[PDB]
Amino acid sequence: TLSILVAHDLQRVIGFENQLPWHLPNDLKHVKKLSTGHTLVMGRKTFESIGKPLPNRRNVVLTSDTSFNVEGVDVIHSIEDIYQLPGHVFIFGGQTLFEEMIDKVDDMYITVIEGKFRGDTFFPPYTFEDWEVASSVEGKLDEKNTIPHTFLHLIRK
Ligand SMILES: NC(=O)C1=CN([C@@H]2O[C@H](COP(=O)(O)OP(=O)(O)OC[C@H]3O[C@@H](n4cnc5c(N)ncnc54)[C@H](OP(=O)(O)O)[C@@H]3O)[C@@H](O)[C@H]2O)C=CC1
Numbered sequence: 001t002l003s004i005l006v007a008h009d010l011q012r013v014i015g016f017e018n019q020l021p022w023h024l025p026n027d028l029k030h031v032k033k034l035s036t037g038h039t040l041v042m043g044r045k046t047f048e049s050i051g052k053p054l055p056n057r058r059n060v061v062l063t064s065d066t067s068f069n070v071e072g073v074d075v076i077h078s079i080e081d082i083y084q085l086p087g088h089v090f091i092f093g094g095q096t097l098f099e100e101m102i103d104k105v106d107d108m109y110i111t112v113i114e115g116k117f118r119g120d121t122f123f124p125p126y127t128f129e130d131w132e133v134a135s136s137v138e139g140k141l142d143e144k145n146t147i148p149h150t151f152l153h154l155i156r157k
């Protein structure tokens with residue numbers, strides 16, 4: 001199973017100066033729930049921005065750097081190596097990789113942040129004509145989660 005796992009805002013911003021533009025603990029829990037025990041694939045820049053691999057799942061990084069090695073991180077150098085990955089596989093970031101992968105994945109787990117942030121990294125444009133809405137659940141606003149947001153699970157038609 002090959003999925004996209006992304007959070008973007010109303011204009012598809014997913015990042016600004018190596019950072020997430022927004023602090024939203026509920027989306028982290030959401031990420032932890034979906035991807036624990038499975039596989040996360042990410043481009044080199046996405047990985048360096050986190051700075052450490054995420055616990056209790058396989059971390060795969062795509063890069064052309066043949067010297068790249070990080071403890072707890074499996075390296076690939078080919079888009080094509082993604083399809084040899086066993087199990088449920090999540091394309092985690094960033095803009096470059098989503099652009100390469102958005103026409104290949106079976107489905108997408110999108111967190112829509114109902115805001116307009118300044119960004120420099122964008123999720124590629126997509127139309128609902130090509131995606132069925134399997135589920136749409138609003139996140140709950142509270143003390144620590146202060147931005148309206150929505151979990152979408154879109155499946156390709
Ligand atoms: N929400 C998110 O997912 C987050 C992402 N970001 C950002 O993403 C921003 C924009 O950079 P972006 O390009 O999107 O980052 P990516 O995560 O897509 O990393 C890009 C790199 O991935 C590797 N790569 C991609 N495709 C291939 C391929 N076909 N073959 C071999 N290697 C490949 C290359 O690494 P290499 O150059 O080493 O060969 C490439 O330079 C960065 O500024 C980073 O901060 C920031 C915050 C959050």
Ligand SMILES: CCc1nc(N)nc(N)c1C#C[C@H](C)c1cc(OC)cc(-c2ccncc2)c1
Nearest residue numbers: 005006007018019020028031049050092093111
């Ligand atoms: C959650 C945000 C998020 N949500 C969803 N639904 N999908 C995603 N792909 C990402 C994402 C992301 C990027 C890789 C990112 C950048 C970052 O820049 C500092 C820190 C983290 C991060 C720090 C701590 N634990 C998990 C992830 C993730």
